Design an enzyme around this catalytic site. Sequence first.
Site, PDB file in Angstrom:
ATOM      1  N   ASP A 190     -96.191 -59.654 -39.154  1.00  0.00           N
ATOM      2  CA  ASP A 190     -95.566 -58.831 -40.188  1.00  0.00           C
ATOM      3  C   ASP A 190     -94.725 -57.736 -39.565  1.00  0.00           C
ATOM      4  OD1 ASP A 190     -94.860 -57.326 -42.390  1.00  0.00           O
ATOM      5  OD2 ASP A 190     -96.894 -56.611 -42.847  1.00  0.00           O
ATOM      6  N   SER A 197     -76.676 -54.100 -43.437  1.00  0.00           N
ATOM      7  CA  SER A 197     -75.845 -55.269 -43.627  1.00  0.00           C
ATOM      8  C   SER A 197     -74.463 -54.834 -44.082  1.00  0.00           C
ATOM      9  CB  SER A 197     -76.470 -56.219 -44.651  1.00  0.00           C
ATOM     10  OG  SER A 197     -75.569 -57.261 -44.971  1.00  0.00           O
TER      11      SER A 197
END
Length: 330
Positions: free
Chosen positions: A35, A199
């Site tokens: 994770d 992004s």
Amino acid sequence: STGSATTTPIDSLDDAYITPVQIGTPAQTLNLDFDTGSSDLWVFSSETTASEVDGQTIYTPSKSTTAKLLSGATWSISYGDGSSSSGDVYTDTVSVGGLTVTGQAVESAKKVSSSFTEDSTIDGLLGLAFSTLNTVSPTQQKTFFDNAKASLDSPVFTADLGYHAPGTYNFGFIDTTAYTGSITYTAVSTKQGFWEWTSTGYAVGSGTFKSTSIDGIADTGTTLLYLPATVVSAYWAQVSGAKSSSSVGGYVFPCSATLPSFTFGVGSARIVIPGDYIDFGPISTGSSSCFGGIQSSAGIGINIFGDVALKAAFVVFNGATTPTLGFASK
């Protein structure tokens, strides 16, 4: 040193991925959820409330000759999905795909919430975010990667998640045969303890790319892709009959639909998520309404590049002095 381990979907929808981890002497092998959104290594154990164990493999520290109780240490964590767990702490030997850390904090669960009990395929979590998020008290503990870093050939690990198929976590090296073209690296903020990046924009299907900054985290421990409501609406608008359902808890779509791809930007580069990756099947057994793999982050407070996005890429988690993230097509 290096390590390499195969990671396997827990079910036919890729709801999560499990990777075998050796703990203790002799080895006790548990299948953990790697994770990159958390920083605790915790396991189902002989100490877990019996009623809360239902099929998981447990760690028994009394059977490990290298296990040492970390005196006075406790842990307690809650995840973005509402789940939680807590217990005490041992140090022990932990190996992943041939890579060994001695003295790793192994967090032994005394209590787990129902969603963990109900998932027999996951024996615990192995956190790979930054150690600043580790919940052990009163002495914070380091992640497995943090403990291994200095011994690794290169201070990196990589995530190569499969679509409806096994993938790979590598530690300490970049497998140049595992991806196509080049790896594009992008800046990371560690201020929230996550692998947080920006992004450069998105496209829906064959549509034109929209240049726009999207701050979010690379999170292997989250199933879906969570993005701003504007973006998500733009995507599902291209699917006839798709709608946001309050009762279901997100965007649903007719199971008879063919989904468009979704592209996200990494600097000047582009990662294409095929439409099939965004189908998570009937909302309930036998339903013709299917659950979408792209959902709104509104109300989470952060955008999450979860498995839906990450499995479309070869992803480098670069833990150099100044961390960065790398993405390549594959």
